[PDB]
Structure 1
């Protein structure tokens, strides 16, 4: 469209296109001393609020905000419903800054009507590793849309990130903004076929009857990798080597420390599931997926769609297809109705044989203040929450 806000930012214009040989900031030589020390101005009657995600009640307010006002599907049927424990995990990774968890209250009601967050992560883009912020959970109450609050939230979190001498960010969105480094479609694998049908997530046809669909998606309750088990603390060193080594082949990925691997992969029920295969004290395969339910809007039978989202999967003792089949089984065993994945890393290679269906959106990946060539999503090696 016009991108009146985005055009003022150090991000590519719609028709910018860079060679593989360009891989650098739009704006370099930035100085912490020059960063604005004043908070951005909000409309009258609204105030900044620093959220303490560790405090159950502040976390609860964020939770209510996103539950009522966060991302809905292309047809307004489902609304994503990140749990409060999920937020706690997502926002308190190693070395996180409380002051990057930013709310906006309406002064008269004392209610949170806006939120944006970031966490620090080292990102390797085209072989250069840069300290970045990973921005997520941008949300404006539905009653306050199209009033230019989001640019205020964006400019304010940028200011706070810059105060820590960080000048790049990574973020994703389902909407097209200037200008994606990569673009990955959603694919879905039906587990609880009948419920997906009944809530309008999937459909049948005259050559696919209900029973024939249920048979189509039926899975054998037996693992290809028989020793796949929930990750424990003892496996942190092993997962660090297995996943770290794997990721280096990609054009975009997080560079995890051991403390980050423990955070991101140690299991938390109804948040993060990590399974590992250990063989001679070495971790040789891993599977992981996170829990992101959607509230089902106005349905008398079901309130919640239980979805698993593929996170990081690595095999050295089986095929990729066999490892993903085990992923679908582990998600079934943990009561999920559907397993979702993006066409990143090696994932697209197994979607046809494992009976994934193409979804409606795509997820665009973005860098702030970074000029580089775009690339196919098989070359993406990071999955944001």
Structure 2
């Protein structure tokens, strides 16, 4: 019934809009009218302002997500974003501490809830809008189905509106009103014995262990011999290469040079970016972020080490040769699997590079924005 979602400026389950429609649900919003009072929490619960730059606050958020965040459809895996990933994800340029919102249970003084936003310029159907990207919504497992989530959502909405920002972007595995795009995820095995042992992957009588291993073997040589970790000097080159590539899509963030530096400069165990420089010019780029999963109840392994395709552009190779190199660089950095969504040009290489179709899909939503939906090939933004 979406008793909560139907009260919000998002499309109804049956709404479809033509390609020309591209506008807010509610316009002419006035900052001066935004409620100034915090949304009421149940008795015994309080808002808490997280300082993600403070290691101990950051560690509380970490512990909350580790224990209570998103699981795969069979509840075999749970996302285990690292503390250093959270810091990177949450302190991008012009970020507001005030958009990093915790809920504590007063008597234990423990964090039981969290939601966060960061500001981003989003171009939707060629209109660039100041938006907030919402992420890390989490309610403790002991407190599910008590309608806390709408309170967290209303409170971040109010705080976003205070900054005169009226649109948001978010992604979920769950179906809500109403996705502007739906993207399946696909997986390319690197450490197949491990994937076989934890049941990320399966064998049959055609496919013995040694045959599966051979299938997914890769040559330890790049197609683009000079692909190297990105360095500060490459920032303008990356801003030029990526900013222009992205113009082609129907939904993409507009990056400043300061954002390109934040989002791409390598950080071990968080973000990996490689570039191919041809006489001072950045001609190709590969990026992926590190997002391990906790393996629940497996005697041998605790962690699934996984690389997540971020942004990839080539002008000197084929997209297939570029993504092959992506897989090889993931393998070199001890990732067990390389994951991609069917956005941008990615689907075109999945068959040949031996990706398998996953279990489900990631839905893209906008808040307070009416437009035509589109196939995932036209989505040019990957969230964290």
TM range (shorter): over 0.9
Which residue in the other structure is 2:378 paired with?
379
Which residue in the other structure is 2:109 paired with?
110
Cα deviation, 1:272-303, whole Å, max 9, x if unaligned, reads 00000000111000000000000010112100
Rounded Cα–Cα distance in structure 2 between residues aligned with 1:190 and 1:81: 19
Cα deviation, 1:298-317, whole Å, max 9, x if unaligned, reads 11210000000000000000
Rounded Cα–Cα distance in structure 2 between residues aligned with 1:154 and 1:360: 27
Q: How many angstroms does 1:325 deviate by? A: 0.1
Q: Structure 2: which 5+ residue stretches go unaligned?
A: none
Q: What SS does the corresponding residue of 1:112 show, helix, strand or coil? A: strand
Q: How many angstroms does 1:210 deviate by? A: 0.4
Q: What SS does the corresponding residue of 1:113 show, helix, strand or coil? A: strand
Rounded Cα–Cα distance in structure 1 between residues aligned with 2:14 and 2:207: 44
Cα RMSD between the aligned structures? 0.3
Q: How many angstroms does 1:356 deviate by? A: 0.1
TM-score by length of structure 2 reads 1.00
Rounded Cα–Cα distance in structure 2 between residues aligned with 1:250 and 1:283: 21
Q: Structure 1: which 5+ residue stretches go unaligned?
A: none
Rounded Cα–Cα distance in structure 1 between residues aligned with 2:208 and 2:27: 60
Q: What SS does the corresponding residue of 1:246 show, helix, strand or coil? A: helix
Which residue in the other structure is 1:60 paired with?
59
Q: How many angstroms does 1:361 deviate by? A: 1.1
Cα deviation, 1:217-258, whole Å, max 9, x if unaligned, reads 000000000000000000000000000010000000000000
Rounded Cα–Cα distance in structure 2 between residues aligned with 1:281 and 1:39: 52
Which residue in the other structure is 2:73 paired with?
74
Q: How many angstroms does 1:132 deviate by? A: 0.1
Q: How many angstroms does 1:102 deviate by? A: 0.1
Q: How many angstroms does 1:24 deviate by? A: 0.2
| Equivalenced residues, count | 384
Cα deviation, 1:173-225, whole Å, max 9, x if unaligned, reads 00000000000001000000000000000101110010000000000000000
Rounded Cα–Cα distance in structure 2 between residues aligned with 1:320 and 1:212: 27
Which residue in the other structure is 1:343 paired with?
342
Rounded Cα–Cα distance in structure 1 between residues aligned with 2:326 and 2:35: 47
- Deviation beyond 3 Å, 4+ runs, structure 1: none
Q: What SS does the corresponding residue of 1:341 show, helix, strand or coil? A: strand
Q: How many angstroms does 1:124 deviate by? A: 0.1
Q: What SS does the corresponding residue of 2:206 show, helix, strand or coil? A: coil
Rounded Cα–Cα distance in structure 1 between residues aligned with 2:190 and 2:44: 47
Rounded Cα–Cα distance in structure 1 between residues aligned with 2:91 and 2:232: 18
Rounded Cα–Cα distance in structure 1 between residues aligned with 2:69 and 2:170: 16
Q: How many angstroms does 1:122 deviate by? A: 0.1
Rounded Cα–Cα distance in structure 2 between residues aligned with 1:212 and 1:242: 40
Q: How many angstroms does 1:335 deviate by? A: 0.1
Q: What SS does the corresponding residue of 1:365 show, helix, strand or coil? A: strand
Q: What SS does the corresponding residue of 1:225 show, helix, strand or coil? A: coil
Q: What SS does the corresponding residue of 2:352 show, helix, strand or coil? A: coil
Which residue in the other structure is 2:323 paired with?
324
Q: How many angstroms does 1:19 deviate by? A: 0.4
Rounded Cα–Cα distance in structure 2 between residues aligned with 1:346 and 1:208: 30
TM-score by length of structure 1 reads 1.00
Rounded Cα–Cα distance in structure 2 between residues aligned with 1:132 and 1:283: 29
Rounded Cα–Cα distance in structure 2 between residues aligned with 1:215 and 1:200: 18
Q: What SS does the corresponding residue of 2:16 show, helix, strand or coil? A: coil
Rounded Cα–Cα distance in structure 1 between residues aligned with 2:299 and 2:370: 49
Q: What SS does the corresponding residue of 2:85 show, helix, strand or coil? A: helix
Cα deviation, 1:62-115, whole Å, max 9, x if unaligned, reads 000000000001000010000000000000000000000000000010000000
Cα deviation, 1:25-71, whole Å, max 9, x if unaligned, reads 00000000000000000000000000000000000000000000000
Cα deviation, 1:308-335, whole Å, max 9, x if unaligned, reads 0000000000000000000000000000
Rounded Cα–Cα distance in structure 1 between residues aligned with 2:188 and 2:348: 14
1:256 pairs with 2:252: no
Rounded Cα–Cα distance in structure 2 between residues aligned with 1:235 and 1:365: 30
